Amino acid sequence: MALYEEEQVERIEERGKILVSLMYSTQQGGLIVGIIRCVHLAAMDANGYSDPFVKLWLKPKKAKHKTQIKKKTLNPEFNEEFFYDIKHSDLAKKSLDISVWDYDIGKSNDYIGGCQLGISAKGERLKHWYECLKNKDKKIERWHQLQNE
Ligand SMILES: [Ca+2]
Ligand SMILES: [Ca+2]
Incomplete structure (x- = not known):
């Protein structure tokens, strides 16, 4: 069995849910986004797990962020925070x-x-x-x- 066949699940939820924190910091002049954890993610690998990570895009380079990858879990803890420089009046x-x-x-x-x-x-x-x-x-x-989506 090839490497990629370990990584496929077709199919064919239940995609899971994510804990997000938001804080506008007046002292810092920007939005602090926290990706804290997820629970009950859908499994997208044949081992019945996933290797989750999370991408952020503030719409409409500096607009994007992404967490680290957690290996083999449906319930990842990330505890990461990301910052956007933006006036409150534009948020x-x-x-x-x-x-x-x-x-x-x-x-x-x-x-x-x-x-x-x-x-x-x-x-x-x-x-x-x-x-x-x-x-x-x-x-x-x-x-x-x-x-x-
Ligand atoms: Ca996969
Ligand atoms: Ca994977």
Whole structure:
């Protein structure tokens, strides 16, 4: 069996959920995004696990970030924080795309799921974003369900 065959799952959830923190820091003049952990991720490898990592894109180089890769887990702890230099008055114009990926070494990475937070989001995604906006210097966390895009 080839390396890449260990890394495939077809199929064919249940993609899991992610704990995100948001804080606008007036002292620092920017948004601090925390990727804390995920739970119950979908398995995208034949061992019944995944090698998760998380990418951030603030829309619309400096716009992107990505965590380290966790090996062989459906419940990764990341505890990473990322910073965007942006006036508070401009933060409502943006959308934060968050996507979780299964790293593979002999093929394309596998998509697990994502969420997008922003004023143009719906439900709990919007709520979390507005809350950060309406409450400076306060760390606001929230679980989000990972969706298909
Ligand atoms: Ca895979
Ligand atoms: Ca993998």
